[PDB]
Design a protein around this nucleic acid. Structure first.
Length: 367
RNA sequence: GGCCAGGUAGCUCAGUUGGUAGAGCACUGGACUGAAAAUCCAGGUGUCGGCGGUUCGAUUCCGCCCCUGGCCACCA
């Protein structure tokens, strides 16, 4: 219908950017971005009115948003900056070549890939490539993005792009950029499954030292990150129904040896989940004594006592220890499995004494 | 879209080591009246958002959604 409405209005609309990339990468997404030559707002309004759905105009931005089923559609007028702008002009202002392509929805040429800068080739050769030298200078946030992309798609930075990147951070543009954009970029990054690789690019190009204050790289933290990777693998393998957000753990490991002030400040800027702040504040002090307690553990019931109150995160942190690993595993796939029949429980009930008694019975079963 | 709170009666508001819920004004009922109100006795003041899960047991622990408000990024 889009090419039809566009036909009627004498306009040209195209699918654009990341979406196109994801399409070419065989990834399906519910968020599609259109670029219209001519008024995009009217296109969106007509579309929404024909499908009979609510529409959300933004006349100052020149863009509109509408949802059809699970599809999320964003229409945007072609512009030359961040006279009518040509498609080519709207594409030239984007970050990397793999993000620089477009696909016509117009009825006559429909299905035709439009590639000006050779984004198809770079996608073909697995290349993260900036459109112009000045790129990272314009938007320093791209610095992270490139890395992020290179991590997820497992692409490589072109020599041009790499040189310009190193030069971009060397000029300290990372500190000058808006804190919010950067922080959000990182928040995106940690949600990747390949986020570890991204951290590797982060360490390689030394961007973390600029954004975080007091952060430095060493071997212990790195090995901790890999051990965390393995633990995450196993946990997300057998216990996968119990999954939580893993990237925050890697973040915690990164900020572990940091001062608590800059740590709480960082988690504050990062708007981390409550369980993340809890796990961090618990890790900063109590964790040592907890480990020392788990070392003194003999009976299984004491282990149950020191463990069960804690969240999954803390346990995943305890799996870092070689000595504690089999113990925590034993706690997970074994130590908690149990129930009690009717008559017995009825006799157990014959206040808090019911709970205490049940605990006495459980510790009677364990040891 | 991420996060933070706030979610408690009809309205306005507190409540942590999980263990049997509260205030101020409206609600019914009766004593009171010619009727009404005040006031007295009292006692409804409630699946403490919705739904699952862990637990003997969840307002609480966790997960997914609902609403409102505020900080935030809002194309790539």
């Amino acid at each position: 219908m889009v090419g039809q409405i566009a036909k009627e209005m004498g306009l040209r609309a195209y699918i654009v950017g990341g979406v196109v990339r994801d399409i070419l990468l065989g990834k399906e997404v519910w968020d599609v971005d259109f670029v219209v030559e001519g008024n995009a707002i009217e296109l969106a309004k007509e579309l929404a009115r024909r499908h009979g759905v609510n529409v959300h105009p933004f006349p100052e931005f020149g863009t509109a948003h509408l949802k059809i089923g699970k599809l999320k559609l964003e229409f945007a007028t072609a512009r030359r900056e961040t006279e009518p702008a040509s498609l080519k002009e709207d594409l030239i202002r984007r970050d990397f070549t793999i993000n620089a392509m477009a696909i016509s929805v117009n009825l006559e040429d429909y299905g035709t890939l439009i590639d000006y800068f050779g984004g198809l080739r770079d996608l073909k050769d697995k290349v993260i490539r900036v459109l112009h030298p000045v790129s990272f200078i314009e938007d320093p946030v791209r610095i992270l993005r490139a890395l992020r992309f290179a991590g997820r798609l497992n692409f490589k930075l072109s020599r041009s792009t790499e040189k310009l990147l190193k030069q971009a951070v060397n000029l300290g543009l990372l500190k000058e950029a808006p804190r919010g954009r950067l922080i959000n970029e990182i928040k995106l990054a940690l949600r990747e499954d390949r986020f570890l690789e991204i951290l590797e690019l982060y360490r390689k190009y030394r961007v973390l030292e600029e954004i975080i204050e007091g952060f430095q790289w060493n071997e212990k933290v790195l090995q901790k990150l890999y051990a965390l990777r393995k633990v995450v693998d196993w946990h997300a393998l057998e216990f996968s129904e119990e999954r939580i957000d893993y990237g925050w753990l890697y973040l915690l490991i990164l900020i572990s040896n940091l001062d608590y002030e800059r740590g709480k400040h960082f988690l504050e800027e990062m708007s981390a989940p409550s369980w993340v702040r809890e796990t961090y504040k618990f890790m900063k002090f109590k964790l040592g004594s907890l480990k020392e307690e788990l070392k003194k553990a003999k009976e299984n019931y004491e282990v149950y006592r020191l463990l069960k109150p804690l969240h999954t995160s803390v346990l995943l942190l305890l799996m870092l220890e070689e000595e504690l690993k089999e113990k925590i595993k034993l706690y997970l796939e074994k130590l908690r499995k149990v129930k009690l029949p009717k008559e017995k429980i009825e006799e157990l009930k014959k206040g808090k004494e019911l709970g205490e008694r049940i605990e006495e019975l459980k510790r009677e079963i364990m040891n």
